[PDB]
Design brief:
Elements: H1 31-34, E1 39-45, E2 51-53, H2 63-68, E3 76-79, E4 82-88, E5 95-99, E6 105-110, E7 116-121, H3 138-141, H4 143-146
Antiparallel strand pairs: 1-2, 1-7, 3-4, 4-5, 5-6, 6-7
């Protein structure tokens, strides 16, 4: 049933979800992608649009909404209870969301198959994200755009 469901959200989640409950990377296997300019966590998805693994003390990439919510004309994505308010609004070509709360920025590239790559740059390195023109962003909108 395809409804014309346009849910107007406030910049907070509708339900209080239980964060992840998934293992934590001890920094090695997927860390190789996180060490790319010293970001704090990167989440890789599967070609179907499901997560491979998210590694941020239970950060809940619900791939389906993580990829979908950006297509809701929303300049704020609220995942894991945090409203990432967009710096740059580019659908598909990577969007940069501000952790309006918490402090930081989530950058997600969207391969049109479901696979999205969200990276997050440290709150300490936040002043550095945006200092070079495309420091961390280059690792995202290039790689996951080709790998679809």
């Amino acid at each position: 049933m395809k409804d014309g469901f346009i849910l107007k959200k406030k910049k907070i989640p509708k339900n209080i979800f239980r964060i992840g409950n998934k293992e934590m990377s001890y920094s090695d296997d997927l860390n190789s992608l996180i060490q790319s300019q010293y970001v704090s966590y990167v989440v890789i998805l599967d070609p179907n649009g499901a997560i491979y693994w998210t590694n941020n003390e239970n950060w809940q990439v619900n791939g389906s909404e993580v990829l979908r919510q950006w297509m809701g004309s929303a300049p704020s994505i609220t995942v894991a209870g945090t409203k990432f308010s967009s710096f740059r609004n580019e659908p598909g070509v990577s969007f940069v969301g501000r952790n309006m709360a918490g402090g930081g920025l989530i950058i997600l590239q969207k391969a049109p198959n479901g696979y999205v790559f969200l990276s997050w740059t440290s709150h300490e390195f936040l002043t550095t994200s945006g200092l070079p023109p495309l420091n961390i962003h280059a690792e995202i909108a290039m790689m996951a755009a080709k790998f679809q």
